[PDB]
RNA sequence: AAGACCAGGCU
């Protein structure tokens, strides 16, 4: 072990990954929302191209 | 949300309708032909059933306290 | 075998299918993930 | 280019530019390069056919898709400067087909031309109609409208969320608002708009509002507060405890109700809040007890929605609490139109005081004209037109930029059919007097969005308040 | 370093001897209102109750300023705090302290700000002294300033989301001052090219054509009517 | 006051049938962008063939430009002046232009006639790509359409180039307000 | 206190300086009932 | 120098809807009585709520609006009760209000509709005027709704939810004879369905001696009152008015 | 936070008189009636009443800010007759003429249902 | 941000079809913030072996 | 407490 690396939702190391909407819904996920940032400390970031 | 229960503009009752209106699409009647159908003559009314998002249904998906 | 002047139906039927497929982020999923 | 869009070997990532006179040819397979989808032409024909149509309709269950259709050398990706040795063509129907020729030599078509922009800049009907700054004005005005940013917000803790009461889908919507899923998650309301000087106190840029219908629910909204608060411990009994204080029995002596706190110190939801009271009582154990409370932000004036206690990373005693308020719009309000006319609301009249139809219809807001001319929001009128079309007809129009399927005499003549003026004039009649209005004033469904900024949250007065330390002048904020 | 303390922008010198934060200042959005007069201003209730103007106790006032005192800080016309010849303040917020409310000549009673003060009234970027001009305070509900339209252009407003500053004289003699120099009808003519400042915008420039052609003939109700909105007017009847 | 109130009974409006001409008029104006067009096509010909002679004291180019923006502006003002005299006494637009309360008439001829050039820099659209302003237009092409004149008018709704030949024309005048701000508060602040 | 589970909505008796985990499921997010005291809304 | 001599005819009249015509009288009385079909005529509405427990995911004042907005049976009653702040007694009593309480829970797996079927009132007068059903809120399992409300006496200038029509049609002179309104082309304008003219003139001659003579209405009722005494109702309170001026300016008088 | 309740609009805070009659001294025989806690419902009523009488030589009205409920009306009439008795009597006419209006409507209205 | 010059803010040629030509933030920072095109894509790069 | 960064609004 070396160190923890953020994790961007919905990628293919997400937990939400491939889950259909009936999972989505039970985790308290919105379908529509698209991922694509991360979680540090609670608040939602997004990196800037 | 959930179907208004007044048209804003005119104040008719439009809450009663959302099912029916459903129903009727449902039943192969177009959007016109189910509003006349329904009884909502000027485009005030109109607009509300014909505009409407009911995300009251997505609400439900998930699972509530207690 | 032309679309003839069908084009209207057409070009919104692929960009559905494009949209269907990629979605909007997969900028940020596929660089992440890569 | 056979073996890229054959896949074999090169991927579709991969650009491939040939400059001729410079006698050089790059390849470039580096990340970072942008690029979007073109339709291969050859000789004078597409490439897509009727097949390709037809399976793509039939996309469901039939596991072909847009990669399908990329493996058929039917579409490819082109880069920036690719895109110099690239002939386009804008349409195949109209330049594709022999005429005295411009070009016969193209190479690529264009998908569609709306694809050019943004996905703010993709909700603004008949764009093209517009004036660029309007449209800018517009795509940067969308990210503040106000709606339902996410259907699970019930189980969110954010701090400054809007939710709106009663979304609604635009009457007049843009072939693309599909994919950006904007009927799920609208922002604004149809609202039936006149463009009159009925009072003056719509004129510059202000907005009359009716309100009856406010009293209706429209535009009606609620405000969410997120308060964060840690247990926590630093010296060796220097410790946070959430405890119920006794108001004169630690050091931060001040009026407010500590009453509302329950056992555990904190307030249980559906406790009305109003400004000064106590939602959290932690008290730091003074190496007496120092008072570390939290309030609310003043005059927020609130109910508590949702209180959570857990533990955090290092594992003490974590809470976060949600007040929520419902805000009526207000006189100081910022609305506005899908075309760049943002407006505060000049004044509301109830539905006695609007001016109506012959059917007894009162619009909902009033513009000033002057705001027209100069701004040269045409878009405006064409979608006021279209929506009126559009709610009598029963279907919802069509606002794509560049169809020309879409002309205003066409709207005009199936606007006659409904028994209304062409051009989307309406006899008003005053609401004061009941007297007819000498000219006949422009009506009609728009869609209107309610913006982030009210005037409850940038209200403010200063009279000897609190003082700086160090230059002894008031505080900034 | 000092010299960073010293050198820029809000640096001491420039941000806080040249500009600084003030006190009795307000800040909203502006709305308009044609039925004010263009030297008025509209003040929502709260600022005005929030804002204060300390007045001398004399013999001619001490009733009603006592009165004032009796409505407190609770009832929105009273009194805020009340400073004895001596210099100590005595406040009239928290508690009614009824001994205290006793008010003889050469008391200060900061009373909430009525109908009839005299403010400063600002936009931003300042660009000329017309960016400034002394207003007459009138009390309106919600929670907007509200000011005449003809106004705009001295300020270049629009009212678009744009918020203007009021600053609240603390003295008799600035009171004097900006009534007696920076009023806005004093203001109407600008030194730098001879013009006038203020000007009928907006619907009433467009109606003002429309009104004065030659094809507008007016019923008497209309009439009569028009010579009800007249402030001037001496009360004769023109024979059409 | 008392207008306002009397505005009351009239009442003011723009729409949509202020902004729509007559079929001769869109006629005459369909007829002089043509010949506008031919007249440039005829002068890029010229200098194709080498024909045309250069002004004194400016370059080839210069001269080319010039006598091409002399006959664009020409035809814009024609149709302009065109649009103008077919408005109606009942028309919002020109009731609120004679009055002077805001508009003018160059935004009524962008309104009914013709948007007109669009200028980046105080200069016709410049090549972007190698030798083209889009990859939609040939190389080498100095004609009205390729360069970024707006044949259409607002009411009739803009071509994609077109479009974006306006959004580059629109972006120099927001560019411009944003920077001009900071040198004239300097300027303003040393003076004091 | 009563504390509803965040994850099975099974209520917790639970009282101060206790550490949070539910005590069906160890999970550790909790949510406060709705008090008993009434509140009085307008239907304005 | 006096009053009108004014005709009433009456042309449909249904269980929604009456339309009506009024000649010979003034455009500004016409104008008033259109005005207080809206603002001016008293009706029943809840306006006091109390929530016990509130588990949708509606939040509580989004639930206590769209009661206030259900329309009520006003057609008996609403004579009978005081204003509350006219009423003798300190709290909610039959004569000043009228209680009605919710009590809903899903325990069926398929989602619940709350509807106005739901409301109970402690008399028969004033259910809900839909008793298909005007839907308050959908309830997923395990969710529950219980309240009490109290309905009180009020008219249209408080709230809309007082307001006791449908939107009111007026209209006058439909061949535009005294030329209050001027067509630029009257040719393109459609037909009024009042209009007495030929199907190939546009408009009726100007008539420079005219003034407006006849009324057209359509009051289209809510459901709370009767169409039929919605007009009754509100001539009565403009009436009332009046004579309340009259009465505290001969006062002012004397 | 600054919005005044509701019943502003028709209920009188508790002092204010309902009418209020100053003399106009710019002309003879004219009058001003305030009429506190009204709107343009009763004002145009009142003054479209009072055109008709022909003793009448000035009658108007207006609302002096609309965030503010209040009627303002000035009467002016020949010089035997006072703007008191004008107003009085048009009261009067109008409520004699909306009784005949009630009588007729509800004629009509049994006219209507029983055929 | 605080550079005067204007030739990186103005809306290039080669934007069309990569970049929305309406889209752009007011103020100091008009053309340096740029929003992506509904079909832009952006390389994700591979070996050229 | 303060400092830093960021985002946005009105000219
Ligand atoms: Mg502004
Ligand atoms: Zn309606
Ligand atoms: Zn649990
Ligand atoms: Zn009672």
Request: proline letters at 4%; hydrophobic letters at 35%.
């Given at each position: 072990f070396i160190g923890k690396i953020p994790i961007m939702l919905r990628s293919t190391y997400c937990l939400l990954n491939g889950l259909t909407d009936r999972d989505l819904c039970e985790l308290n996920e919105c379908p529509l929302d698209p991922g694509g940032y991360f979680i540090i400390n609670g608040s939602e970031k997004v990196l800037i191209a | 949300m959930i179907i208004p229960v007044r048209c804003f503009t005119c104040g008719k009752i439009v809450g009663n309708k959302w099912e029916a209106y459903l129903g009727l699409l449902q039943a192969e009647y177009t959007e016109g032909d189910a509003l006349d159908a329904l009884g909502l003559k000027r485009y005030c009314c109109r607009r509300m059933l014909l505009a409407h998002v009911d995300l009251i249904e997505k609400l439900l998906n998930y699972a509530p306290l207690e | 075998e032309i679309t003839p002047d069908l084009w209207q139906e057409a070009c919104w039927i692929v960009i559905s299918s494009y949209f269907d497929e990629k979605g909007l982020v997969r900028q940020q999923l596929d660089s992440f993930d890569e | 280019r056979k073996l890229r869009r054959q896949m074999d070997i090169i991927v579709s990532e991969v650009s491939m530019i040939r400059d001729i006179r410079e006698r050089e040819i790059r390849i470039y397979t580096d990340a970072g390069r942008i690029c979007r989808p073109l339709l291969?032409?050859?000789?004078?024909?597409?490439?897509?056919?009727?097949?390709?149509?037809?399976?793509?309709?039939?996309?469901?269950?039939?596991?072909?898709?847009?990669?399908?259709?990329?493996?058929?050398?039917?579409?490819?990706?082109?880069?920036?400067?690719?895109?110099?040795?690239?002939?386009?063509?804008?349409?195949?129907?109209?330049?594709?087909?022999?005429?005295?020729?411009?070009?016969?030599?193209?190479?690529?078509?264009?998908?569609?031309?709306?694809?050019?922009?943004?996905?703010?800049?993709?909700?603004?009907?008949?764009?093209?109609?517009?004036?660029?700054?309007?449209?800018?004005?517009?795509?940067?005005?969308?990210?503040?409208?106000?709606?339902?940013?996410?259907?699970?917000?019930?189980?969110?803790?954010?701090?400054?969320?809007?939710?709106?009461?009663?979304?609604?889908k635009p009457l007049v919507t843009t072939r693309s608002m599909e994919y950006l899923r904007f009927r799920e998650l609208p922002a604004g309301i149809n609202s039936i708009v006149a463009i009159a000087s009925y009072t003056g106190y719509n004129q510059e840029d202000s907005v009359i509002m009716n309100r009856s219908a406010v009293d209706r629910g429209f535009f009606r909204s609620v405000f969410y507060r997120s308060y964060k608060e840690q247990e926590s411990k630093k010296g060796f009994d220097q410790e946070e405890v959430f405890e119920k204080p006794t108001r004169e029995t630690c050091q931060g002596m001040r009026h407010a109700i500590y009453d509302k706190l329950d056992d555990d110190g904190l307030i249980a939801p559906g406790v009305r809040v109003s400004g000064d009271d106590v939602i959290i009582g932690k008290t730091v154990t003074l190496p007496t007890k120092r008072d570390c409370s939290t309030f609310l932000r003043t005059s927020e004036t609130g109910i508590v929605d949702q209180v959570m206690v857990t533990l955090n990373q290092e594992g003490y005693k974590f809470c976060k609490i949600r007040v929520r308020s419902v805000r009526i719009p207000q006189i100081g309000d910022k609305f506005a139109s899908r075309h760049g006319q943002k407006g505060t609301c000049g004044i509301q009249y109830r539905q006695e005081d609007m001016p109506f139809t012959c059917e007894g219809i009162t619009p909902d807001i009033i513009i000033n004209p002057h705001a027209i001319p100069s701004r040269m929001t045409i878009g405006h009128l064409i979608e006021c037109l279209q929506g009126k079309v559009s709610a009598n007809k029963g279907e919802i129009g069509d606002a794509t930029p560049f169809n020309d399927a879409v002309n205003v005499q066409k709207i005009s003549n199936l606007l006659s059919d409904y028994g209304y003026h062409l051009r989307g004039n309406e006899v008003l009649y005053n609401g004061f007097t009941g007297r007819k209005i000498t000219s006949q004033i422009f009506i009609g469904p728009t869609y209107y969005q309610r913006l982030k900024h009210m005037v409850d949250d940038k209200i403010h007065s200063r009279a000897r308040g609190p003082i700086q330390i160090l230059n002894r002048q008031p505080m900034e904020g | 370093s000092l010299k960073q303390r010293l050198k820029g922008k809000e640096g001491r010198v420039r941000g806080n001897l040249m500009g600084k934060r003030v006190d009795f200042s307000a800040r909203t959005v502006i709305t308009p209102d044609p039925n004010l007069s263009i030297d008025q201003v509209g003040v929502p209730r709260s600022i005005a109750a929030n804002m204060t103007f300390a007045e001398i106790v004399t013999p001619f006032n001490i009733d009603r300023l006592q009165e004032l005192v009796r409505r407190g800080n609770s009832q929105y016309p009273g009194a805020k705090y009340i400073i004895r010849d001596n210099g100590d303040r005595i406040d009239l917020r928290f508690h009614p302290k009824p001994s205290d409310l006793h008010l003889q000549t050469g008391y200060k009673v900061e009373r909430h700000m009525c109908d009839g003060d005299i403010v400063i009234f600002n936009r931003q970027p300042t660009l000329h002294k017309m960016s400034m001009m002394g207003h007459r305070v009138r009390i309106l509900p919600w929670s907007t300033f509200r000011l005449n339209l003809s106004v705009t252009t001295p300020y270049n407003a629009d009212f678009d989301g744009d918020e203007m500053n009021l600053h609240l004289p603390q003295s008799l003699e600035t009171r004097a001052e900006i009534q007696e120099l920076a009023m806005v009808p004093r203001m109407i003519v600008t030194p730098q090219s001879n013009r006038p400042v203020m000007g009928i915008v907006q619907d009433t420039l467009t109606a003002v054509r429309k009104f004065t052609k030659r094809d507008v003939f007016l019923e008497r109700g209309e009439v009569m009517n028009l010579l009800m909105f007249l402030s001037t007017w001496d009360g004769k009847v023109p024979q059409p | 006051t008392v207008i306002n109130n009397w505005?009351?009974?009239?009442?003011?409006?723009?729409?949509?049938?202020?902004?729509?001409?007559?079929?001769?008029?869109?006629?005459?104006?369909?007829?002089?962008?043509?010949?506008?067009?031919?007249?440039?096509?005829?002068?890029?010909?010229?200098?194709?063939?080498?024909?045309?002679?250069?002004?004194?004291?400016?370059?080839?180019?210069?001269?080319?430009?010039?006598?091409?923006?002399?006959?664009?502006?020409?035809?814009?003002?024609?149709?302009?002046?065109?649009?103008?005299?077919?408005?109606?006494?009942?028309?919002?637009?020109?009731?609120?232009?004679?009055?002077?309360?805001?508009?003018?008439?160059?935004?009524?001829?962008?309104?009914?006639?013709?948007?007109?050039?669009?200028?980046?820099?105080?200069?016709?659209?410049?090549?972007?790509?190698?030798?083209?302003?889009?990859?939609?237009?040939?190389?080498?092409?100095?004609?009205?359409?390729?360069?970024?004149?707006?044949?259409?008018?607002?009411?009739?709704?803009?071509?994609?180039?077109?479009?974006?030949?306006?959004?580059?024309?629109?972006?120099?005048?927001?560019?411009?307000?944003?920077?001009?701000?900071?040198?004239?508060?300097?300027?303003?602040?040393?003076?004091? | 206190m009563i504390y509803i589970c965040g994850e099975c909505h099974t209520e917790n008796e639970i009282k101060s300086r206790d550490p949070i985990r539910c005590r069906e499921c160890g999970y550790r997010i909790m949510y406060k009932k709705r008090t008993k005291r009434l509140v009085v809304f307008d239907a304005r | 120098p006096y009053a009108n001599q004014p005709t009433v005819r009456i042309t449909e009249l249904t269980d929604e809807n009456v339309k009506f015509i009024i000649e010979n009288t003034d455009l500004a009385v016409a104008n008033s009585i259109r005005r207080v079909f809206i603002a001016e005529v008293p009706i029943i509405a809840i306006d006091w709520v109390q929530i016990d427990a509130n588990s949708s995911v509606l939040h509580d004042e989004f639930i206590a609006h769209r009661l206030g907005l259900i329309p009520l049976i006003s057609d008996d009653i609403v004579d009978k009760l005081q204003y509350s702040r006219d009423c003798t007694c300190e709290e909610f009593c039959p004569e000043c209000s009228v209680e009605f309480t919710l009590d809903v829970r899903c325990n069926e797996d398929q989602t619940r509709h709350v509807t106005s079927r739901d409301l109970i009132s402690n008399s028969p007068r004033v259910i809900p005027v839909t008793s298909d059903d005007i839907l308050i809120v959908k309830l997923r399992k395990g969710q529950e709704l219980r309240l009490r409300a109290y309905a009180k006496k009020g008219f249209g200038k408080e709230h809309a939810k007082w307001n006791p029509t449908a939107g009111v049609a007026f209209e006058y002179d439909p061949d535009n004879a005294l030329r209050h309104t001027v067509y630029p082309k009257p040719e393109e304008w459609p037909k009024s369905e009042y209009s007495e003219l030929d199907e190939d003139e546009s408009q009726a001659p100007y008539d420079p001696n005219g003034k407006p003579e006849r009324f057209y209405y359509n009051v289209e009722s809510c459901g709370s009152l009767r169409p039929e005494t919605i007009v009754l109702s509100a001539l009565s309170g403009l009436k009332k008015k009046l004579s309340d001026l009259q009465t505290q300016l001969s006062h002012e008088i004397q | 936070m600054n919005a005044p309740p509701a019943f502003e609009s028709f209920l009188l805070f508790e002092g204010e008189k309902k009418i209020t009659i100053n003399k106009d001294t710019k002309v003879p025989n004219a009058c001003l009636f305030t009429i506190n806690k009204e709107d343009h419902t009763l004002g145009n009523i009142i003054k479209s009443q009072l055109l008709k009488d022909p003793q009448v030589l000035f009658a108007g009205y207006k609302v002096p800010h609309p965030l503010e409920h209040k009627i303002i009306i000035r009467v002016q009439t020949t010089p035997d007759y006072s703007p008191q008795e004008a107003f009085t009597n048009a009261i009067t006419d109008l409520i004699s003429e909306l009784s005949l209006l009630e009588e007729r409507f509800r004629v009509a209205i049994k006219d209507k249902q029983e055929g | 941000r605080d550079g005067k010059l204007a030739k990186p803010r103005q809306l290039h040629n080669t934007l069309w079809g990569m970049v929305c030509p309406a889209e752009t933030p007011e103020g100091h920072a008009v053309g340096l913030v740029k929003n992506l095109a509904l079909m832009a894509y952006i390389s994700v790069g591979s070996q050229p072996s």
């Open positions: - | - | - | 291969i032409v050859e000789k004078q024909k597409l490439l897509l056919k009727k097949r390709h149509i037809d399976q793509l309709k039939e996309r469901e269950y039939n596991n072909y898709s847009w990669q399908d259709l990329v493996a058929s050398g039917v579409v490819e990706y082109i880069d920036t400067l690719e895109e110099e040795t690239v002939m386009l063509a804008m349409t195949p129907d109209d330049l594709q087909e022999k005429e005295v020729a411009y070009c016969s030599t193209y190479t690529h078509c264009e998908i569609h031309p709306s694809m050019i922009l943004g996905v703010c800049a993709s909700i603004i009907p008949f764009p093209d109609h517009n004036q660029s700054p309007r449209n800018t004005y517009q795509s940067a005005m969308g990210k503040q409208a106000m709606g339902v940013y996410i259907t699970n917000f019930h189980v969110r803790m954010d701090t400054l969320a809007h939710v709106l009461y009663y979304p609604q | - | 505005l009351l009974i009239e009442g003011h409006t723009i729409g949509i049938g202020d902004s729509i001409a007559d079929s001769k008029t869109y006629q005459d104006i369909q007829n002089t962008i043509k010949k506008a067009k031919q007249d440039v096509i005829e002068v890029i010909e010229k200098a194709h063939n080498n024909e045309l002679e250069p002004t004194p004291g400016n370059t080839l180019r210069q001269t080319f430009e010039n006598q091409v923006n002399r006959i664009l502006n020409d035809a814009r003002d024609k149709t302009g002046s065109s649009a103008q005299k077919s408005l109606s006494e009942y028309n919002n637009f020109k009731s609120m232009v004679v009055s002077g309360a805001k508009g003018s008439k160059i935004n009524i001829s962008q309104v009914i006639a013709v948007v007109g050039q669009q200028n980046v820099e105080g200069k016709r659209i410049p090549f972007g790509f190698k030798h083209r302003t889009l990859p939609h237009f040939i190389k080498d092409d100095y004609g009205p359409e390729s360069r970024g004149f707006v044949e259409n008018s607002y009411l009739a709704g803009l071509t994609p180039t077109e479009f974006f030949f306006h959004a580059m024309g629109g972006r120099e005048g927001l560019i411009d307000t944003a920077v001009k701000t900071a040198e004239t508060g300097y300027i303003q602040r040393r003076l004091i | - | - | - | -």
